[PDB]
Every structure is written in C-alpha cells, then in structure tokens.
C-alpha cells in the first residue's frame, strides 16, 4: 500500500520501458465503447455521435431508458428496433482490439475486462479465459423464463432483430433477451470472482475507451495495488476524482503534484495503440495481424 514510483517518466515512453522490464508480467486491460467506435459501433455519451444524442425517434423518458431493465421489461420493442439500427453488417475488430490480441499472444495479458457487448474482443481472438464481459454479451441469448432458460446463438438473435420479430423462445414463447446486463441488473458472478483474484498481482493497468462512470466496472482501477502504473488511452481524460464527491468518504492522478503512476495519452485509441506498439517494437507485427485479419473477414 506504499506509493512508490515504478515508471522512469510519466509518459507513453515510460510505460513502454516498464512493459519490457522484468517487473511487467501481468497486464489487465479495461476497455469501453471508445475502442469500438472505429468499428462503426457508436459510444453512448459522445456529443453529436453518441447514442443518447441520437434517440429522438424512440418515445423515451430520458434516452438512458433504452438500456434500463425496468423499461425493457415494460416495452422491449424499442431496444430490439435500436439493436437493428446498430447491428453491423460486418464485425471487424479494431487496431486496439488486435493490440490486446498481441498482449495475449506475448503472454502479457492476464485479463481483459470489457464494458462492450459487441463480441469484437472474441472476433479478435481473446478466449473466454482471457475475457471478462462485465456487461454480458450479444454472443449468446436466453429465454427469460426461470423454468426454461433455453440458450440461443447470435445468428438466431440476428435473424430475429433483422426480421423485426420480437424474439420468442421456441420451447415456451417467452421473450429471448440477449445476455447483456441492462442498467439496474446485477453483473455476472464471473466479474466478481475474477476481480477478487487478478488485481492481487497485476503489474500494469491499460484503460482504453471508457469514461469510467459506469459502476461497479469503474471501481476496478482502485483494486490495483497502489504502485501498479495505470495508462489511459482515451479521447479525453477520465477517472480523476471529482472535487466535490471526493471531499466526502483512489482515482486517476495524472496532473497534480502528487502524480506518480498514472499516464494519460489522449486521442484515438487506434492511434495510441499504434504509438505504444511502435515503442515496443511491435508495429510491423500489429500492422500485419490487422491486415491479415481484416482481409480474412473481408473474404467471408
């Protein structure tokens, strides 16, 4: 619980040296909707482009409602119709997804905790072992009837959403809901069991494309030991303690006089990942994987 400083410099270059030191064996990524905007899935809270800014159409009390469970229970048709608007024709993971692939392939990834539901991390080749889908996934779907709970795969869910048929179980004619965690719902047990263990021995926390304002996911940054360096790759800074909430009974500290282990690289996640890869000597490796994988997906 001492706040010793393990980076030689609070910069990307500092992080890159640390990552190739003996001190850096186990990396945890925490990622959010920002890593998937370049794959054509909009984030929620961006101005102009974010989802909440584009839900005039659905007769909603606050645009937040479309992802709230109590609303979904009353009227599920809006969520399905939105799911139709957003569902990509092609699922192509981004440079940043592939960056995490490289982490896994080099034995550095202890886990990716993701707020995304879009399966892109699996398509880039992170297995269920490497991955904690904290808000669940579109990957599978289940009948909501406690006595049934039949599982359906995405091709079935997709056909129902592109059909504009409100998806209904073939065994019982109950609603079939994608295995995502709505607002108001409990996170999956795997989330809690993983965090109780992995933050005991993490050496680096890589935070990409998240506002860190959805809880309990956001609390993950405080779970790390106090000397674990934390790098944020994001369009804007996030996770710093609010001045007022703060005053009542640790957040990211990039800039105060007290700063010792948090680094903010601000821009496109795709660029930050490329920048970090270049420093690590991985740039060719990342360019080739991304191109090979996109070509592969493009010829399906």
């Amino acid at each position: 619980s001492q706040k010793e400083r393990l980076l030689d410099e609070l910069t990307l270059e500092g992080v890159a040296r640390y990552m190739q030191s003996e001190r850096c064996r186990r990396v945890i990524c925490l990622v959010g909707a920002g890593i998937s905007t370049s794959a054509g899935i909009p984030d929620a809270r961006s101005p102009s482009t974010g989802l909440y800014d584009n839900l005039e159409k659905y007769h909603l009390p606050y645009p937040e409602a479309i992802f709230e469970i109590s609303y979904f229970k009353k009227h599920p048709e809006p969520f399905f119709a939105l799911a139709k608007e957003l569902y990509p024709g092609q699922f192509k993971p981004t440079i940043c997804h592939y960056f995490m692939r490289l982490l896994k392939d080099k034995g550095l990834l202890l886990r990716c905790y993701t707020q995304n539901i879009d399966t892109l991390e699996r398509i880039a080749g992170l297995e269920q072992e490497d991955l904690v889908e904290a808000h669940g996934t579109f990957y599978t779907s289940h009948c909501v009837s406690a006595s049934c709970r039949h599982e359906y795969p995405l091709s079935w869910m997709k056909e129902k959403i592109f059909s504009e048929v409100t998806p209904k179980c073939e065994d019982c004619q109950s609603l079939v809901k994608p295995d995502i965690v709505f607002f108001g719902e409990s996170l999956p047990a795997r989330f809690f069991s993983c965090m109780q263990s992995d933050f005991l021995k993490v050496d680096l926390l890589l935070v990409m494309g998240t506002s860190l304002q959805v809880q309990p996911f956001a609390s993950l940054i405080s779970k790390a030991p106090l000397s674990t360096p934390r790098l944020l790759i994001n369009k804007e800074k996030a996770g710093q303690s609010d001045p007022f909430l703060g005053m009542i009974m640790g957040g990211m500290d990039f800039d105060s006089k007290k700063a010792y282990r948090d680094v903010a690289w601000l821009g496109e996640c795709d660029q930050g990942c490329l920048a970090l890869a270049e420093l690590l000597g991985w740039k060719k490796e990342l360019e080739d994987l991304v191109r090979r994988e996109h070509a592969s997906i493009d010829a399906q």
Binding site: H135, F183, G184, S186, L187, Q215, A218
Partner: peptide, 7 residues
C-alpha cells in the same frame, strides 16, 4: 447486491 448504474 451491486447493480449496473451510472454515478
């Protein structure tokens, strides 16, 4: 029971 919520 810790639930999914903004804060």
């Amino acid at each position: 029971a810790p639930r999914k919520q903004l804060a």
